[model samples]
Structure formats: C-alpha cells, structure tokens
Target: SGWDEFTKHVTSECLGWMRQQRAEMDMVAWGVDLASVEQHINSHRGIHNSIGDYRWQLDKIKADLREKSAIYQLEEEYENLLKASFERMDHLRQLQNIIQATSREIMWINDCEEEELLYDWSDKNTNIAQKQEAFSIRMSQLEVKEKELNKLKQESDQLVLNQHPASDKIEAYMDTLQTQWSWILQITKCIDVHLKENAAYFQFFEEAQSTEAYLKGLQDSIRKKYPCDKNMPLQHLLEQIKELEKEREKILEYKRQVQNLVNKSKKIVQLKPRNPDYRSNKPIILRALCDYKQDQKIVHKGDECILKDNNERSKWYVTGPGGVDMLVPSVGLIIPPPNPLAVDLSCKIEQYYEAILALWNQLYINMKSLVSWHYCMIDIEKIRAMTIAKLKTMRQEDYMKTIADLELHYQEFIRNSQGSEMFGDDDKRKIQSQFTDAQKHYQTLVIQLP
Candidate 1:
C-alpha cells in the first residue's frame, strides 16, 4: 500500500504539469496550432488515468537524468510544474529556454529593418518587353516589402509570452522590446504611405509606354482597312476618307469613277505586314454581298473572324471554315447597319483615344509629383500633344466612323461581356459593369470628359 501510494503521488503531480503545457503551447505563433499536445494528454481515459501513463513514460526518461546528476536542484518557484521526478527537471528547463529563444528570434526579425528590404523582394520588375523596368521594379519591391512586414508583424504578435518568471528586469526588457516592435511597424507604415502616394506613377508609366505602341499598331490596322498611301498619317487619311465618302453621299458633287476606284484600291493596301501569330476572337467581317472562300474554306460571309494584316492585294487574313487561316478580299468588310456593331465600334474608338489621352495625362501627373526619376520620365506630354492634335482634327463623322468600325470589328467583345477564363467572377462583373456604364454614357448627345 505504501509503494502504491508513492506511485499515485508521482502520477497525480505529473498530470498537473502536463495540463499546464497546453496553455504554454497555445501562445507560440509557430504557424501551427499545437493542439496535438492537448490531445495527447486528453486521449488518456481520464486526468486520473492519464497521469499514471504520463508518469510511467516520463520516469523512463527521468531515470537517465538522475543517473547523470542525482543531486541537481530545481528552482520550482513557478517552474518545474511539469517535472514528474526531480530527474526530469532538466527537460522542463530546456522547454522554457526554447520558448524565450523563439520569442527573441521573432523580435529580431521584426526590428531588423534593412534599407534593401524593398530591393531584396523584387523579381527585377518582370519582363522588360512587357513593362517599364525601373519604375515597376521599385514599386513591386516596395509593395512586397510592405506585405512582408505586415505578415511578419501579424505572425510575431501572435506569439504568447506567458511562462517566464515575473520580475522587474523582465518587464523592463519587454517594454523596450515592444517599443522596438512598434517602431518597426510605424516605420513600414510611413514608408508604405510615401510609396503609395507615388504609386500612380508606376501604373501610368506602364500603360503609357506600352500604349504608345498599342495605339500606333491600332491606328495602322484601322487605316489599313481602307485605301490610303503607305506614308499617310492616320489622322490625314481619316480626313481624306471622310471627304471621299462625303463625295459619294452627294449626287451632284460627283467624283470620276476612275478616281474613286483608285482611291478604293489604296484603302486595302497593306502598309505593314500583320503578325501571323497575333490571335483575336473578334468579328472582322461586317458586310459582304456573296460568301468569299480560300481553298474551299469560307473566309468571308459577314461573321465574326480572326483578322490579320493584308496579303498582296490588301486583303484581311481570317480563320476560314474548318479552322483554316487564309487571306480574303477586304471588300464588303465593315459596312455597319447602324446597329450594335456600328454603334459599339464608334464607342470603342472613342474609348481607345480617350484611354490613350488619359494614359499620357496620368503620366504627366505622376511625373509632376517627382522629377527625381529624371531621364526615366519620357517626353510624355509630346505623345499627349500628338493625341490632342489628332483629337483637335477629329470631326463628328471621323469619331463616329471610328466607333462604328470598332464596334463591327469587335462584335464578340462588344456584345458579350463574358470575360476570358483567366478572369475571376469579380473581374468579369467589373468589366461588364464598365461596358454597361459606358454604353449609358455614350448615349448622351454631347459626350463630356471628366
């Protein structure tokens, strides 16, 4: 009975210590909830039953510790609560040491604010061909730095520091440690705000540079739809085509048939070769009297088609029947019926011009914020001026024609707000909303820019 009583005492004491571990384990922000520790103790039949099992296993390890140094003492003021035997005291000490050690490491990670933190996070601003390298690099790096700082603080703050012995010295140290942590949090916030103020620069710079190429390609593509000299500016050609079309509208102000045919011939002339690799799902064929074919594949019958730059006679490349790609006559293409295709094309062109203008203007605003970026800033206004000059010459007909043709050309995108599979549902909704709002706005008799 005496031996049995001693065994029960050991088991009950160790059980109390084991339950305390759950609270300590709860505090560490090690990215894993150590629920396993609680589960391990609870899995025993009961706290009464579990204590015996714990003591049995603990004694096996404890025996070895006492074998090494039986005379060792434990400062059991609030510690050694987990020790099943005096022999197991060393193990408990190691656990407390580890908790403190982990906490200090987390503190270091928080307070160590290297100036290169931003640069270190950059992926070199991604592909240079796709982005403005320098500005994008800085922006991405700063964004990443802020994200990293935020995550680190959130995780580190989650670490609970409860088991350490209470003392004036520990409280004094902890207070300063928290102050350092606060400094880190505050500094990241301030820097992130500074960068965010300049964030528009990164966005505007990216769009403006790429759109310089995009709008140029677009201008060329639309001009290629009609007859024009190889060297004609799109604006000049647009004015010329408008006058030419006006001549057709008036019976008395007639032009020579030969001159008309010659002018029409230039409309389909290919100035720059289209890239065969460029793919689009938009409708390119708007009108045709009869179905045209290439190698038995129907190339044109006023359907949605993928288009390309002209072939020898300035024909558009299209995906024909059976998925074959072939060149066909640009004739009878883009004759809008004043319907969905026509109206949308007018809106699309107006949208693109406005977009290009906005991009250039936004870049000016971004640059105005800081010139420290120096030569990195292009003559953004020069392009803006060019766009404005083009806009200055824009007649009501020219603008309407642009909208009509674009609407006809992009029937699929214009009529269907369905986004590509890559877009999330939220993005798809935003795109659809924009189109819906834009449609409502474009309906106004006099369109105004804000």
Candidate 2:
C-alpha cells in the first residue's frame, strides 16, 4: 500500500511543498558547521534579519547557551536522529511482534470461519479459487492496516518533533549577548585598524622631517653663499625642498578638487523661480491639504473649506461656498503641490512638458539601473546592465509587454516600500518562522556528526 502508484501523486505533492520550504530554510540556516556555523548565521541573517551576531558570537555568548544554541539547533537535530534510529529499531521490534500477532489473528479468524461456517465437504464447500479469493481480500485489508500501524509508529513522537525546534530557536535569543560582544569586538578592531591606517599618513613626516631639515640647512647655507664657487652648498637642497612642496601640493590639490566637484553638484540643485504674485506649492489631496493647512480652517468664511477638522475649532481652510470655497481642487490618491518628491515648473507648453517627461523617463531609467538581482548590494551595475541587455533582445511587441509588467511590478514595490515601511511586524515574524522551520528540517536531513 505504501508503494502503490495511486498514492504517489498525493504523497509526493504534499511532501514536495514541505520539503521545498525545508530546503530553502536549510540552505539559509544549516551549512553552518561547528567551526563556521556562527559565521554563516551572521553573514546570512545580517543581510535580511535581525539575527545579528548570533552566527559569529559564540565565544562571547554564554558557553552553555552557545553550546545549547549549537546543540539544540544542531544538537537537537542529532538527538532527533539518534532518537529516531532507536525508535526505528524499536519499530523493527514492533513490526516483528505485529507480524506474529497478525499471523495468529488471521489463523484464529480462519479457524473461526472454518469451524462455524457451512459444512466442509469435498464437493459442496468452497473451491480452491474461492479460498484464494478470500485469502487475497484478507491480505489487502491486512496490508492497509499494517501500513497505518507503521505510519503511527513514525509519527508517535510527532508533537515533540514539531515543537522542539521552535523552542531551541527561541532559546537562541539568549545567545544575543554573544552576538553583541562579537559585534563590539569586531567593530572595535575595524576602528582601531582604520585609525592605525589613518595614522600612517603622519609616519611619512617622521622620515621626511630630518631629511627636510638637512635639506633646508643645506639650502639656507647655499642661499647665504649662492654662486660662491667651491664654498656654495649645491642647489640640490632647494631642488629637494621644491619636490617635497610639489608632493604636498599634489595631496592638497586632490582634496580641493574633490570638494570642488561636490560643491558644483550641490549648486546645481535647480529650484523653480517663484513669482511674488504666485502662491508656493499648494497641496492637492483633500485629506493632506486639510491636515497640512493646519488641520482646520485657517482661511476665513470668505474662503470656503470642503473638509473640516475633527477638533471643530480651527479656522484655516480652503475656499468654498457659503462658508469658503476650496482655493484649489482636492484629490485623493493624487496629491498636489509642495510635492517634495517632485519639482514644480512653469514654462512654454512643449518645453515644460517635454522637460518633465524627459525627467520622468530618466527617473525610471535610473531606477532600473539602480535595482539589483542579488541580496548583496555589490554588482548592482552589472546586474542592471544584464537585465537591460536581456530586455533589449526581446521583440518590440514583447518588449512593450515586459514594460507593462515592469510598471505593475514597480507599482507594487512602491506601494510596499513607501515611507520606509517596507516590512511590518507580521513580515518579520513570518520570515523568521519559516527560517526556523528550515533550520530545523536541515538539521534533520544533513545527518552530520555535529
């Protein structure tokens, strides 16, 4: 029954889902051997999770807890396998027992049927074929029962299997101290190295100082007695001094050039020229306009307001009817002026619209250029280039279709990422839960000696 082709799809599909989830998490969670487990965890989780330092901070974390985290995450896995092996051994014992027991039951049932049923006669009783048919029916039934029995045996410690992994994971939180220590130590080392490197620049002055002094003395002596035939110190000192000054100026020039470029870019931040007569960027969204104008009617009754503040006492408002009329049109999702994310322009129709349109095109182009494929922020330009290359190869019609898809995908990305609120509590928890499950499962399958 367990080997039946009819059940292959059912079992395989369900197990496939479970195994796939298990595999991804395992790829992320396991592969951390005793020596490098902490390292792996730190590297992987640091990218996408707050599981910071847990991977590489074993030494600073309580030894017992680190070992426990190691043990439970890794150890529980071994213990689970050890227990399973023993259980399977026990199962073999049970199966041996069941075989005998079942044999007896079948014999007893056969005996009861034979002894109590219709009279046995060579000519009138059931034929050999009929006997065989009865035997076959009983065999299939027993096979099904036996399959269920084995499954029960496998699943017996099931709750223990499911819950232990999570407990181990939560227990890992205690290891955070280890993570913090490692982080601090690592950061301190990096800073110290940086300071040491920076201090290297001053090292040049040490050797150069005496040479510079000697050279300066020679130059002073030579200048005090210039062109004085044999007594004149050669002008090499002056030449040496000039070279040093040139080298020093090279360094200064580099800094100056860098600052100059930065300032030039900063200065190019073009803003619209506002006329004294024109009001500054006004908001479009009714809700935002109401809140932004001061959450109440700041405008007078001569000015009508469409949306009112909840406080009921504020007077800053939009121009409206008998009250005040809305100064400008109101909108919902489409928010209006003082648009911080956009620049305002007033110019000729073609010039203004085309310029803005060009800016819009450039924005998307730059955005696509900025996006990357891998988790690591490295190789962004290469990955973007590759994506563009792939897109360019498509047929024009197909290209347009992909553009539509890109628009939708970007919209969804924008919606999710708006205001830096990309991930909520639920997202973090779900990712964590899935990750733990993976860690648990990988610890199960890898079967290492940990």
Candidate 3:
C-alpha cells in the first residue's frame, strides 16, 4: 500500500505540471493568434496594445521553458512559435515604420492640395506687387516641401529595398505624391508665366497713362494763343517767343517718353504672343503719339506765324498789306473834305528830305537874325559909352565861334540820320542839301559879323 500510494502521488504531480505547461502554451497561442490579425498590427497603437504585453508574456513562457524540462515535441513547438512571433513582430515594426513615413508624406500632400485649392489664380482684386510677393513666398515654401519629399522618397526607397510587406502600398503612395508634386510644379510654372506677363502688361498701361497725361498738359499749354498786338513792346514779344521756343524743346523730352512707352509696350507684347489686345493697342498708342507730335509741329508753325506778324508790326505800326486789308474790311473808309484832301495830297507829294531841309534852313536864318540883332544892340551900347571898336572885335569873334559849333552839331545830326533806317533816299538827299546850305550860310554870317 505504501509503494502504490507513493507512485500515485508522483504520477499526480507530473500530470499537474503537464497540465500547467499545456495551459501556458494555450495562453501563448491565444496571445499570438490575437496579435496575428492585420488590424491588431496595422498601426502603432494597435501593435502596442495588442502585442506589447503579449511579447512579455511570451518571454516569461520562454524563461519557464528554460528553467524546466518539458517533452521534446512541446519544446520544439514552443521554440518554433517563439521564433515565428519574433519574426512577425519584427515585420510589423518595419511595416509600421513604412506606414509612418507614408502617412507623413500623404499628410504633406494633403496640405499642398488644400493650399492649392485656396490659391487665387485671378489677379483682378490684387496688384502686381502683391501677386509677385505671394508667388515668391509660395515658391520658397514649395522648395522646402520638395526637399522634404525627396528625403521621404529616399527613405521609402530604402524601405522598398528592405522588402517591407507594405512596400507596394508605399510605392503607390510615392507615385501619388510624385503626381501631386508634378502637378504643383506645372501649376506654379503656369502661374509664374502669367504673373510675369501680367506685371509687364500693367507696367505698360501705367507708363502709357502717365505719358499721355504729360502730353495732354503740354498740348493744352501749346494750344493757348500768344498775344500779337502791335502795341505790345518788342521786348515783351521776344519774351513770348522765347517761351514758345522752350515749349518746342519739351518736344524732345516728350519723344523720349514716347520711346520709353514703346519699349514697354513691345515688352508686354513679346511677353504674351498672339494676344490681339496688346498687339493692336501698340500701334494705336504709337499713332496717338504720332498725332501728338504732329500737333506739336502745328503749334510750332502757329508760333512762327505770330512771330512773323509781330515782326512786321515791329518794323511799322501797320503790319504791311495784309494788316491794312484786314483793317479796311473791318473799318469803313472815312471821306476827308476836299480842301484838306488837296493839302494832304500836296504835302504827300513833297519829298521828306525837302521838308527837313526847309526846317533846317529856317532854323539857320532865325539864328543869324538873332545874332545880328544882338550885335546891333551891343554896338549901340558901345557907341553910347564911346567903346565901339573894342566891342565890335569881341562880338565878331564870339559870333563866329558860336556858328562854328552849330556847323559841327549839324554834321553830327547828318551822320546819325544817314545810318538810320527811318530815312529813305529822298530824305538822305534833303539832309545833304541842308548840310550844303548850312555851310554857305555859315560863310555869309562870318562875313556879316564885322
């Protein structure tokens, strides 16, 4: 009975240990099977929650297997299961890394798509400067994103080479990312070209408008008529002409402005080829500039006309035949009385030189008579004082000296009048005759002096 009881206890103990081992195996198997599902290992959280505790349990089971000897088949099964679970965990970890990398890339792509959707392609509300600034910032931002994409691609390439189970999905994500990147590049290129062309277009119109305003102001100034009244001083007329000359010089500045505008227009047209608005408007603007230039020329001609009219008026109060005809049509002819008409005709017939001669002769005769009367009074006073001879000699010398000075004065007047434009041939002859008459009268007066 003691031997049998001892044997039964030993058998029970072994059976209990075996049952515990089987239960541990069942637990390990259950844990592994739970972790084996794709959803349990697909994400970091899922893998952590589902497999993290199971890995410790598996390690404990492995330790237990090491400490105690089990059946050979059971040991072999446990070793295989541990080996497979370890390999699967390692694979799940690799797949998680790939998914993490792909997720970051996909998120970036989503951000880029959202940004693209929010972008304003039309520049109707914004100015060129603002558009250019926005474009520059966007390009810089895209450059940073592009570099990050390249790094992601390189990491994905490494993952693909490593042969992750999700390599196919990662590749597909990379393709999608590359497609989005290519599209963004294409869109950026298109916007870049459009913005540059639009900037040039806006610049052309701005310069054109400024130039046109200046031209219009110049035209208004040039259109004003200059005063051409005969009563206006020659100095004043010359000042007016100088102002016109200054305006003419401004035409050079205007031409420079026009050339600048033409260059800008050409740039705009070249920037956007086959655009009819810019191309056709270029010629129209040039034509308008040409018309303005022509108007400037006409203004110059008008100035010349005023200058001519004033020049004629400067020479004489009457502006030649044209001035007289214009006045005659405006003012009726006034008939003069017969006697005054006859006298005017007689005076008009007389040479201007003859009238000047008669005046000078009369002046000489009056001077001579005054000298004679003065000497006669001196003679009478001398006779009364019984001093006649001395007084006569002194008086004769004084009279001759005065008459010599008068002759010099007459010669000076003749010299000045001969060079003057006012005197014609007839007037010159009369002055010459007056000089001769004065010389003869001077000699006669000297003889009569004593």
Candidate 4:
C-alpha cells in the first residue's frame, strides 16, 4: 500500500510540474504582443525566468520519475515539452530583436523628420558659401545615417524571414520606414537643389549690384563740371581736355568689362526666373562723352565776342582796334581757362584785343623810326647827288654837323631795334640786319663827307 501511494504521489507531482511548465511556456509565448522595443525588453526578464524555471523543473521531474521508476512513461512527453519551450524561447528572442531593430529605425526616421523641421528653408541673408558647406556636411551625415538604416533594414529583413509571430508587424513597420525614408530623401534632394539655385541667385545679384554702383560712379564722373576761372591759361585748358580723353578711354575699357558682366547677368536672369528679387533692367546706356566746347558768347572788358570760327589749335579771332576782327596767337591771350566750353568768351576776346593793341603800338613806333631813317637816307642821297666839290663848298662845321646828325639817327635806330618784347626772335634778327645795313650806308656817307 505504501509503494502504491508513493508512486501515485510522485506521478501526480511530476504531472503537476509538467502542467505548470506548459502553462508558463504558453504564457511566455502568447502573453504580450511585444509591440514596442521597451515592451520586448521588459518582457525578457519574465521569459528568461520561465525558461530557467522550466529547465529546473524538467530536471527535478526527471529525477523524481527516475526515482520512482516511471521515467519511460513520461519521458517522451517531457522531451516534447522541452523542445516546444526551446522553440518558443527562440521565437520570442527573435521577436525581441526585430522589435529593437524596428525601434531604432523609427527613432532614426523621427530624428530625420525633426531635423528637417528645424532647417532654415526661408533664410535669405545667410552667407551662401558657409550655407553650402554646412548643407554638404549635413548631406554627408545623412548619407552615413542612410547607410546605417539600410544595414538595419537588411538585418530586419533577414530576421523577418524566420517567420516569427510578429513577422507581419515587422514587415508592415519596415514598409512604413522605407516609405518615410524615401520621402525624407526626396525632401533633402529638393532642398539641395533649392540651395544651389539660391546660391546662384544671390551671387548674380551681388555682382549686379556692384556693377550698378560702378556705372553710377562713372556717370557722375562723366557729368561732373569743372569751373573755368578767369585767370586760367590755355595750357590748363589743354590739360583738361587731355584728362577728359583719358577718362573717355577708361570709360571705353569699362564698357568692355560691363558688357561681359551684363551679358552674364542676362544669362543668370534667363536661367533663374523664379528668383523674385532679380532685376532685369539696369542702366545700360551711359551719357555720351560731354561736349566741352561752349556755344554761347560772354562779355568781358566791354567786348562782345564768341569763340566761334576760332581755330583752337593756334590762333583765336578777336576785335582789334576800331572794331576790326583779327587773328592773334593763342599763346599771348590771357583768359580764365579750364575746359574750352567753360572759357569766358568775352575774357578771351578782351585778352586777344589787348594782345593786338600791344602789337599794334610796337609796330607804330617801329614804323615811325623807319620813316625817320628813310628821310635821313634821302638827305644822304641828295648830298651824294651833289658833287664832291659842292660837298666841299659846304662849311666844314656844317659837314661835321650833318655827319653827327646821321650818326645820332643811326644810333637811335639801333637802340629802337634791340629787345622789343612785341616782336619774335626772327623779327629781331631782321630788324638788326636792317640796322646793320643802315649803319653801312651811313659809314659810306661819313667817309664820303669832305
């Protein structure tokens, strides 16, 4: 009776333990959905405890069965239960790994979305080079992240191939992750293209604005007027014209550079019509080189005259004495000078008349001296016409006085011809030559005087 009771007790205990282990395995397999990575992790401890307890209980049950000599009756059932438990543990572990991978993918996608939201898409004032550099760095980081995500995706796909209880969930999750990744990639590509376009747009405007400022400065320089003062000289006027010509050459050079810049700007405008801040029309035409010649006449020193018909290269026309128009050398005229256009015509006319008056006065004095010389020569000729006997009949004192008078007149002619400011060097040379001839004739007369 004791042996039957002991066997029955041990059998019931082993059966009960097996039932408990089966119940625990069933709970581990179907207890939680393991929907999230955190849930999977939290459920691991319980699953591990159950798996451990099952092994321990299986060992104890085997010992009890062997002790009772009932090992053969329940051995197959025990082996089957152990196999099922191990398979269930493996499945649960796979599900946990898949969940963890899915969680990481979800986190990466969320992070990308958040970063996208933080991007400054509408910022216009940022430095383009730095912005591009920062964007490129971000793109590299995203590329690295994309590679990591692809690796995770491949790993998840392999995990899902095992057909775990949550395989369908993982598949759905992976599909959603892929879709979101594609969308993020598309958004990033769009932004990348937009950044480049923005860079081009801003670059064009930067140069265009600079070119416009340069053009404005050039226009101002071309239009700027210089004052013509009354004391300015013709040399100063020539210098002003020379400077203007230099500026004209500079403008021509700038025109070539500006032509290229404008051509490039036009291409940029054509290529980027979407840029709202683009300016198509700029100041293309510059004011023609200023005309420095004046048309109107001016009044100065009570003279009414204009520079019209005056050859600016050498001589200018002016009203001479008695209102007669005459040409005078340009160098002698003293008038306020700057640009020819700015020259006070009246001042120039007054100077020209002054020059003419000085010349005229000097000529009048010279002619008077010549007239005196002619009469003196005529007197000498008449004396010469008289015979030497007649010249001897004249008083010696009278002859000496005539000779003295002729010598004094010749000396006066020589004195008048020297250092005349109004005449040029050639004129002085001719006058000196004439005085020498007169001196020769007078010497002959003096020598002939008896």
Which scores higher on TM-score, 2 or 3?
A: 3
Q: Write the per-residue lDDT of candidate 2 for residues 1-450, one digit (tens) a residue.
A: 234453444344434543453344445442212334445434434332321232333223224332233324433333443344344334333333333443443454444333322222111222434544554565566466556544543443342354532234322432332333233333223323323322332232233343334434443443343221212232443444455455445434534533433333322211121111223354322222112222353332123234432111112233333454433212110111232322111112223233433433333332232231111122222222333446456564553443344445444434433323224557446544544453444334334323
lDDT of each: 0.39, 0.34, 0.45, 0.52
The candidate that achieves the highest lDDT relative to the unseen native structure: 4
Q: TM-scores, in order shown? A: 0.22, 0.16, 0.43, 0.45
What is the C-alpha lDDT profile of model 4 across 360-417, one tens digit per residue?
Answer: 3454444434444454555565444545556667776775566566667666655654
lDDT (Cα, tens digit) per residue for candidate 1, span 164-268: 322233344445555555544544443343233223323333434454455546444544444422333435544554554543344222223223322322232
Cand. 2 Cα-lDDT: 0.34
lDDT of 3: 0.45
Q: Write the per-residue lDDT of candidate 3 for residues 178-244, one digit (tens) a residue.
A: 8667656655654565566556555655656565555545444443444233244445545565665
* Weakest lDDT window of 10 consecutive positions for candidate 2: 267-276
Sort by lDDT, best first: what order?
A: 4, 3, 1, 2
Model 1 root mean square deviation, Cα atoms: 32.4
**What TM-score would candidate 3 get against the native?**
0.43
lDDT of 1 at 207: 39
Query: Model 4 clash pairs?
Result: 230-336, 294-341
Model 3: weakest 10-residue lDDT segment is 284-293
Clash count for each candidate, listed in order shown? 10, 26, 0, 2
Better of 2 and 3 by lDDT: 3
Query: Candidate 2, 193: how far from true, in Å?
Result: 4.0
